[PDB]
Write a protein that binds this DNA or RNA. Structure first.
Ligand code: ANP
Ligand code: ANP
Ligand code: MG
Ligand code: MG
Ligand code: MG
Lengths: 123, 353, 379, 372, 422, 308
DNA sequence: TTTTTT
């Protein structure tokens, strides 16, 4: 119940996505990472506990409960999404510059463009 | 007790099935999905909790109890079932299209047909009408590749029949040859067909035509399982020969071949095989059995919008309407592909002598 | 204690057996079944809970206690048993048919025959009847493919005997060639047999005929274990084409009771051979070497009736590879694919079994129909 | 404490042993059983509970508490044992037969001989008799296959000696070829031997002759470990058509006490050779290289009696590959499959074993019967 | 707390050690043992419980508690120790024998030498006596195999210098026991296997003809810390058309470390202490001849035939034998019964004492390999104007090309000329 | 959470670091151990017990709680760090040598330099001295293998400049062909260098260029040898990636080098050092080791300073 | 993971 509520609150931030190949991508440190190379979902669960209310933060300091929240999260993800399809973009290490206005969206808006490759310098 | 009751109630909806090939299939999001690397049964248990009483639903929130329910369900499935047994049904990502009536089913009506494959895209019921300028404009590329003259009636009818055959989930007794020059309409037809049926389409090379099917892994033949159309696109200028035994083996309902690291050697053949040829083919051996399995569609109409509009999936639900119409036209009541052994120069002498 | 009592009661019913292959076989839904990667003991424990006292049945609703009962059961099984030792029993999904007499056993009577293979479908007593509208059509089809004339008597008898040998769980001493020209009905027979016997039928590639059978993993040989019918199709023109000849040693290895070959990721190299091997062809076979041993293991059945379309009716009556020309039926493959003549053909096969398996059924060679054997026949 | 006492009492009966190959063997049902996929130690713990006091037997009905006893036992076994060191003992499911005495041992008498292999069936003392209705049939069949004539005297003795080598658990320095024309009884002898000795018999492929033996995993050579009989069949005439020669070095590695080769997913590369290797052939073998070392390891037994149907009776009388023509029997094949002549053939093998162990038994080559 | 105290007390006994590879070696039954598929630490914990207070021994009867102590012990082992650093110590199942001196150590006196391998059998003092009929029979057998004559003096000495199978150090040469059939080459192998037991290993021919990689190679991984490696049989490299011996494997089998790991293991490095002996009826043929390869090959020849009475005439009329004797059919069974194990061990120790003067090393014999004949003459004739035709006629003026034709053909063509005659 | 508080204080020591390879490095026994098997974080947790409050130390005696702390620590490491950054440091198996400065940062002052590859042997300063016989025992050697005489001046400068180059933790983009004949002393160089940098020195064959690349990471020197005359070839498409790699690639030959195809860009990445002046048991006995170490350090504050 | 496959 409480852990399911915590998993539901995390699921509302769209920080974890499922790809068609059969893997998960996690939005941590302002970048879309990949699983199958060290588990990153529990790292995200531990790093997001500040946004959750106070009674939902002390529960996430327990490694076993974080695994329960992870198991809950992996069950609510049923629809797959594609990665890096938008042809007019230029990712950077603070966001993704657009290709028409010259605008450079960062942070919350940069999460919409699910990109795994990048230029390599700040902006 | 209570978890066993939940598992029994879930099993009554027939949402989990055991297959002949040895896999589990689950009905999630208007599709049948295979249990091979992800825990789909627990996902189904979590999703289906809204069709349960208020006392059985507040208990499926615990991941530990969902595993118990899954374990109970796994012991209840003892008898396997057969899938993909409806040749006149077209599956999508959201339901099944009936090629006879034209009706579309999306939910509990779609799960009655156990289709494990799909086109890979969503169906649009608003552009599948007849009207609208899109369809009226699509009668300008087809009518240009194959004109509507009196000298081209038989060839165009054969072309339409061959294109219609890609909608049927059944075994075809002939392999078709698209014979023509460059930029004559063959690639446009290939791209339109790929857009219209999506993931039910496959491109191969020459390993299935010139080589031997057995004796080792053949990943390009086990990939043709339950797929409705296969294109042999890039023919080298014939080098290895056609090896008529291979084309004979590609006609039977069952095809022998195994993937890498696998022991399964049987595949179901529902594919319309079309070979794009620019030069006269040469066969290892020509006999009456080879004559009975070859058809030729010839492109003899020499010709930048028609390069990205097709790639943008613009003619996706317009070409599909034409395919359904031609499907209806050529089922009277059984559609059968017939050979044309006179349209091959190599078969000229063998007919008389 | 209580769970041990449940396990002991389950063991007394002899519903779990250990075979001399490492497998555990269970008796669920009137059939012996096993799965290497999906152990079925807990499924049997769940299914058998209605033959126990009501206090012992509730405890079996817990998945964790079923595992305990399974662990107790696995420690009770020490000795192995031999399976598939009755050649005159045809196993179905819901019972066993006795080919000697004709009765169907659908309970503990079918349990004593430890058959680990089956047709895959249930047996229907209302269609294994003989007189039916479907059976009359089957007689017409079979009579068209193999007419009952005086010049086709021996060929028709060999055809019937080869077809009826597919119901027997025993090692056969010959490989048969269904030889004929195009559109002579030698695939209709194959489809009819596949409909009749179901999962007791298998198709394999030509590599079992032309390649070495034990150079690494060979899934095309390990899939013939306990199968009663193996089909090969469309060998190439060995003469007017550059093709690999058959190999006389493979033919001799495909006749022995035990065949050597292993699957991928497996250490088991022995397979039981219970199969009738049929190769359907448009050309006569060509071998590496001809000797008396090879000429003793091969039989040939001829197909000489052409099923054509009105256009080719005149061209067919002139060709000398055909003895009769009949109009093609375009709605026949669909009827076979829907298993319309499944039980009529099963009844026909059982009747032929009765005719030919008295007292002992044994396949015999037909060396006179092979041109490659001509020279050795001259002397 | 209490489970430790149970484990200590179990280990005092010497019912569990650890072998030099790092493997666990358990004495169950009058047999030394071994399997790495079965829970044999817990099986023994469950089966041996009747020898324990009543306060301990009821403690062993829990699967969880049998695993504790199994762990306690596993921590107690440090030393290793040799096993399979008696060549004059034939093991069965329910005991061991003494080939030099003829006496069957059961219980703790068979436990002394640590045999980890067996025929796979139970020994019946009412059929191991020299006077049966089946013995006359078996002698008739064998005398038909190998006649007792003056012209056939060394061949028959070599046949008997080779067949009786399959009872000895020792390394043998010769390979034998059963050579003959079609329908001469070469497979009937193989089937009779397989019925007689059961699981001590193995059939393998020709890849152990014409290929390398230790390049990657090779179950075809790894399954011959501690087997007393290996059969190969259908040599593909390495003379006329395109073919691969046998390999002279492969023959020499098959006569060594140890054979190098490993199974799948296994680190064990040594196999102990106790096998008589027999190859059924219609043509004489052809080798890539001929050497004096190869000549010392080859023996040939010839089959020259034809079993034919009456229709083919006339044609067999003109073939020089045959010395006698006899009527074929179609019930023989099915009767052999039903293990009708199991114990009669076993008695014959033991009787010949006593005949050919004149102190020691040594297989000898026949170099004169090879065209090469 | 209490289990941590038990682990700490067990650690102070120095009965568990960690090696550089990462192995855990335990001191049990007066021997150092390591095994990745055997619970050795819990075995030691169960065995050592009698050296602990009474209140601590009761805690060690529970297998669940022994695993906690094992985990605690595994967490305190942070430093690696070097093992098998004494070449002149022969470990048995119950102690260590000093080869240079002859004293047998038992208990804590053998624990000082961290010998992690063993013969597998106990050392017997009453059989290491040199005064027994078994010794006379063994000496007769050895003298039959390798006669003590003047013409065999240099070959018998190389045969004796077998005694290298006792040294726990890297050997820089590979030896071929080359001979005709029935010459005693397998009898020596069986005697050595009986004498040294588990320090002897037999592998396949793929270590000489295949490529050594990082993949799972049990045939290489099973040679770790072994003092004798035998490879039996070698095909004829000309008439059979088989794979030749790769020259790069000869270099890698001489280095102190070899690359190869078992299945389901990450131990990629193996320590090389082995004498490599190959039993042959044919002399080796290599795919690439060079000066480094010719420095690592030695050949011992067997020229005594043991034959049955029928075959004595042909044996005496053969140029591959110098002596013909009668075969003994009971010797093979006696050797398998470990009858000459300790007599042969004593003989090997006596030979070991002879060839340490004070350092023993193996010398190659390049003149016994026909494959090396061309390179020796070129090396001793040439030293690294001069027309090609002049060089051709000068080099063919003395040598005959009836056998060395392709050799000079390849040397002139492939190896193109700053070369001056001596 | 007591265990989370314990894991907080262990991360405020920088004893566990995450690498871009996907693994962890642990500072245990005064060495940045980097292992993909065996539990190192639990070993560190048990060892760091004494630097923790009294109530926090009793909790770490349970393996079950140590594993929980390990899981907590592994869930808090999100950002990777790079190892082996400083180029002027010599990792010895006691610590780190600060080349351009003179002092050995012995045991704990060498944790900021996250070096993962060492010379494999200990280092001292009593024998690493600025004088004493061993300094002159090889003066004759280093002066007769390579003299100067104002005619072999630049040759010797390059000789003992590319020698000192095998002390730099930065890419040496140059392939100096050690020309000369036999017995000129290029094997004395070979044995003096194996006795200077230990496992930081690697040997190879002709295959590196004529046609041993995986195990060249942080390798500070390669000394390909035993080469036959080419007149395969140098395969000129190799130097493009060969010099693109923390090693000074030294090729010593007894013959003339012939490249596959010389262009206007090929003769800009090749150096040469000639030996126009054409021990063992004592040179392999590590008699100098630290003396040759000083010789290299001496040549380091030379030409390579302030840039090479 | 090893085998299988290259
Ligand atoms: N008794 C029958 N009456 C009418 N049509 C029939 C009959 N038997 C078979 N056919 C049809 O005849 C056609 C040819 O039969 P088929 O089994 O394919 O012969 P085939 O020899 O295998 N052809 P091929 O593989 O090229 O040699 C098929 O369309 C069958 O449905
Ligand atoms: N000193 C001996 N006295 C009597 N018999 C002996 C003696 N040494 C060896 N033998 C026997 O002689 C036979 C041949 O010896 P063996 O060890 O097989 O030589 P081999 O070289 O390995 N044979 P091969 O593999 O063909 O070259 C065996 O039966 C030995 O037991
Ligand atoms: Mg057909
Ligand atoms: Mg036979
Ligand atoms: Mg030998």
């Amino acid at each position: 119940n409480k852990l399911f509520n915590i998993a539901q609150r995390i699921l509302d931030t769209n920080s974890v996505l499922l790809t068609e190949r059969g893997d998960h991508i996690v939005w941590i440190n302002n970048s879309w990472k990949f699983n199958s190379e060290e588990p990153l979902i529990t790292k995200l669960i531990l790093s997001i506990r500040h946004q959750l209310p106070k009674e939902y933060s002390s529960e996430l300091l327990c490694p076993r409960k974080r695994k329960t929240v992870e198991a809950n999260i992996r069950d609510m993800l049923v629809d797959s999404v594609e990665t890096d399809t938008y042809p007019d973009k230029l990712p950077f290490k603070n966001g993704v510059l657009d290709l028409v206005d010259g605008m450079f969206y960062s942070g919350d808006d940069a999460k919409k463009y699910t990109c795994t490759v990048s230029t390599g310098f700040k902006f | 007790n209570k978890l066993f009751n939940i598992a029994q109630r879930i099993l009554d909806t027939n949402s989990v099935l055991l297959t002949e090939r040895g896999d589990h299939i689950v009905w999630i999001n208007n599709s049948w999905k295979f249990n091979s690397e992800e825990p789909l049964i627990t996902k189904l248990i979590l999703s289906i909790r809204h069709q349960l009483p208020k006392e059985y639903s507040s208990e499926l929130l615990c991941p530990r109890k969902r595993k118990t329910v899954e374990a109970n369900i796994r012991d209840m499935l003892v008898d396997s079932v057969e899938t993909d047994t409806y040749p006149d049904k077209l599956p999508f990502k959201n339901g099944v299209l009936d090629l006879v009536d034209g009706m579309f089913y999306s939910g509990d009506d779609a799960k009655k047909y156990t289709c494990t494959v799909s086109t890979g895209f969503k169906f649009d019921d608003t552009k599948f009408v007849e009207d609208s300028p899109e369809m009226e404009e699509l009668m300008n590329i087809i009518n240009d590749i194959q004109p509507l003259t009196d000298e081209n009636k038989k060839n165009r009818e054969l072309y339409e029949k061959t294109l219609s055959s890609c909608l049927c989930g059944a075994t075809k007794g002939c392999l078709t040859f698209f014979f023509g020059e460059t930029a004559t309409g063959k690639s446009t037809t290939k791209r339109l067909l790929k857009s219209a049926i999506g993931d039910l389409f496959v491109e191969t090379g020459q390993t299935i035509l010139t080589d031997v099917l057995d004796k080792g892994p053949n990943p390009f033949i086990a990939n043709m399982h339950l797929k409705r159309s296969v294109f042999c696109s890039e023919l080298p200028d014939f080098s290895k020969k056609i090896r008529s035994d291979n084309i004979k083996k590609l006609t039977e309902p069952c095809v022998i071949g195994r993937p890498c690291f696998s022991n399964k050697i049987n595949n179901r053949n529902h594919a319309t095989i079309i070979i794009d040829t620019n030069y006269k083919p040469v066969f290892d051996r020509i006999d009456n059995a080879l004559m009975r399995r070859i058809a030729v569609v010839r492109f003899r109409t020499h010709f930048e919008g028609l390069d990205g509009k097709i790639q943008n999936n613009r003619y996706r639900f317009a070409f599909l309407y034409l395919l359904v119409k031609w499907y209806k036209k050529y089922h009277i009541p059984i559609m059968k592909l017939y050979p044309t052994p006179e349209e091959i120069p190599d078969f000229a002498f063998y007919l008389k002598i």
